């Protein structure tokens, strides 16, 4: 009767357990977002800021709220200082703190898992960075790829031994679209977006259907 945290933890893990998955990875151009999503109205991937992206899994309304909360937090910082002072690290920490509190006090924990992706400025040679925040308020800093949603084990390994640096865009889309296939069928019925570092400002771009066709390999 003190480890209700174990239970609450389970409630979340199970919620994220079912439901589609998402794959975020690093590559030549910047950061790739491949997430299973049949809808075209609702999303799981979104622009966070100029060089930040956001992707999540779990209960919609909940990770959706956090998505907005981020957009706002980012904008606030940008407005209060300079757009250049907005960092992924900041939002990551932010989210970690929020989910952690929600987990501890809110009546029902948030059945959510979030990924914050950052990509260096136009010129800067710095390599993209990734962050993952979980329902209990835990974070890790992956520099290669992040998997979340549904059953990860198979998709994780499928990537674990399938990832490479400077991995071409088309290839990367494949690397991921395959890691998804194997474990949990996977037509051009997804939500794919990218954080193109070549762009000067916005950096976030969504990859349509016609352009996707020429990127998603078959089985």
């Amino acid at each position: 009767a003190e480890q209700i945290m174990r239970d609450r933890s389970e409630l979340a893990r199970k919620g994220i357990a079912r439901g589609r998955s998402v794959v975020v990875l690093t590559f030549r151009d910047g950061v790739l977002f491949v997430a299973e999503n049949p809808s075209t109205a609702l999303h799981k991937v979104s622009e966070l800021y100029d060089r930040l992206g956001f992707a999540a899994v779990g209960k919609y309304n909940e990770f959706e709220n956090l998505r907005r909360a981020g957009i706002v937090h980012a904008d606030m910082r940008g407005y209060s200082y300079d757009r250049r002072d907005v960092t992924g690290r900041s939002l990551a920490n932010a989210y970690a703190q929020t989910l952690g509190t929600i987990f501890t006090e809110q009546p029902k924990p948030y059945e959510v898992e979030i990924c914050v992706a950052e990509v260096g400025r136009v010129g800067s040679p710095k390599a993209p960075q990734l962050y993952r925040i979980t329902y209990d308020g835990s974070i890790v800093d992956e520099q290669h790829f992040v998997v979340m949603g549904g059953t990860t084990e198979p998709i994780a390994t499928a990537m674990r031994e399938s990832y490479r640096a400077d991995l071409d865009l088309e290839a990367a889309v494949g690397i991921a679209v395959n890691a998804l296939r194997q474990g949990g069928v996977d037509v051009a019925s997804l939500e794919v977006a990218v954080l193109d570092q070549s762009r000067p400002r916005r950096a976030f771009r969504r990859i349509a259907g016609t352009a996707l066709e020429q990127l998603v390999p078959a089985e």
Binding site: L66, R68, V72, H73, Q97
Partner: protein, 251 residues
């Protein structure tokens, strides 16, 4: 961590989490430049002077009065420089944030109605001599006449907005003269270079009678700032295109 505004308005967020940042809560300072707006074939454009004055003194001679507020719209603001700058900035964030939230941009009218809301908040400072008035232009994506997609909206100090539809408009000390020059040298649907030329010229005529202006100056190399908006979006005109068009105007 707050969940943001219910209406997806960055402003409305501040209104309830950081009121201090709003205009509502708050010559002794440099003031705004003369700004002209013309409508033409492709889209619309804004050209602004660079003279910031405080009293009879020239405070700055490289003031950028025109800003790209969003992919398909820009605005210039005249009046207390400090207030003006802050205002246009907030306006930009307002628009951009709405998009990142709703996944869609605001209608032009929506954008214009927001700017009003903001100006309207400065009404207090306005009545105390710290007034500021913006001039908004944009390429109306939801328009029929892709040739008449350009629009110009002028403002009050009490927050009213007005559709111009005369092909041109101005704001700022020289506005009076500038508008009167455009009344003569401005021709409807025309080149982006013809309109941009007419604008840079009107600033010349304004400088003639308004000491708070003094637009193009070939000797010192001070040239107007401009921005054009067309189906391609909003783009900053280059100093070259400006200075060049400037010399050509001279006889």
């Amino acid at each position: 961590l707050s969940f943001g505004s219910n209406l997806s308005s960055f402003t409305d967020y501040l209104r309830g989490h950081a009121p201090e940042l709003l205009p509502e809560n708050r010559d002794l300072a440099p003031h705004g430049t003369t700004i002209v707006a013309l409508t033409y074939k492709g889209g619309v454009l804004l050209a602004g002077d660079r003279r910031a004055t405080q009293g009879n003194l020239i405070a700055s001679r490289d003031v950028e009065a025109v800003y790209v507020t969003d992919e398909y719209s820009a605005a210039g603001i005249a009046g207390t420089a400090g207030i003006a700058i802050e205002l246009v900035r907030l306006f930009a964030v307002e628009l951009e944030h709405y998009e990142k939230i709703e996944g869609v941009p605001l209608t032009f009218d929506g954008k214009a109605n927001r700017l009003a809301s903001m100006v309207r908040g400065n009404l207090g400072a306005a009545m105390q001599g710290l007034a500021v008035v913006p001039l908004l232009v944009g390429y109306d994506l939801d328009a029929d006449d892709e040739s008449r997609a350009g629009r110009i909206v002028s403002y009050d100090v009490v927050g009213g907005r007005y559709e111009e539809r005369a092909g041109y408009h101005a704001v700022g000390s020289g506005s009076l003269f500038a508008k009167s020059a455009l009344k003569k040298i401005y021709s409807p649907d025309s080149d982006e270079e013809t309109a941009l030329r007419a604008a840079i010229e009107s600033l010349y005529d304004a400088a003639d009678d308004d000491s708070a202006t003094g637009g193009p100056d070939l000797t010192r190399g001070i040239y107007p700032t401009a921005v054009t908006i067309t189906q391609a979006g909003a783009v900053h005109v280059s100093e070259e295109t400006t200075s060049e068009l400037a010399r050509r105007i001279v006889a």
